[PDB]
C-alpha cells in the first residue's frame, strides 16, 4: 500500500477538482500506456489491485511504471457521532485524477499482451480510460 513516509500536516482541506491534465499526459517511460479520460479519485487499494492484475497478466516479462501516487489523506467520523467536535481521523489516501492523466506504462512487452493486461486492469477502476502509445510529437 502506497503512502507518504512523512507529512508536514496530518489533515487537509477537501478542495475542488477542476481542469485538465496538461502535465503527465505524455508517454515518457514505456511504449504503451493507459490514461484516464474522466475525472475522479484513485485510492491506494485500487492502485494496488490494478498493479497486481497487470503484473499477473504480463507474467513479469516487462517493466511496469506507476505514475500516480496517493498523497492526500481523507478523514471520516467515527460513526454514531454527532456533528461538530473537531475533524475526524485519517482513514485512507487518494490521488486526484484529471482527464488526460496517465496511470500505468508498460515497457518490453508485446502490444497484444499489453492491451490484454490493460483491458483486465480497467475493470477495477472507477473511471473511464483509454490506451495510448508513444509518438514523436
Amino acid at each position: 500500500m502506497l503512502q507518504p513516509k512523512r507529512t508536514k500536516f496530518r489533515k487537509v482541506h477537501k478542495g475542488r477538482n477542476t481542469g485538465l491534465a496538461h502535465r503527465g499526459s505524455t508517454v515518457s517511460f514505456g511504449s504503451i500506456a493507459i490514461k484516464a479520460t474522466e475525472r475522479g479519485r484513485m485510492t491506494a487499494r485500487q492502485i494496488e489491485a490494478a498493479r497486481r492484475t497487470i503484473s499477473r497478466r504480463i507474467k513479469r516479462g516487462g517493466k511496469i511504471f506507476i505514475r500516480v501516487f496517493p498523497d492526500k489523506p481523507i478523514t471520516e467520523k467515527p460513526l454514531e457521532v454527532r456533528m461538530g467536535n473537531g475533524k475526524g481521523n485519517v482513514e485512507y489516501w487518494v490521488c486526484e485524477i484529471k482527464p488526460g492523466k496517465i496511470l500505468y506504462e508498460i515497457e518490453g512487452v508485446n502490444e497484444d499482451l499489453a492491451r490484454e493486461a490493460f483491458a483486465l486492469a480497467a475493470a477495477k477502476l472507477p473511471f473511464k480510460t483509454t490506451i495510448v502509445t508513444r509518438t514523436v510529437m
Partner: peptide, 12 residues
C-alpha cells in the same frame, strides 16, 4: 519544417 504541436490532453 514542423517545429511544435499541441494536442488535446484527453482526446489527443
Amino acid at each position: 519544417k514542423i517545429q511544435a504541436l499541441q494536442r488535446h490532453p484527453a482526446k489527443n
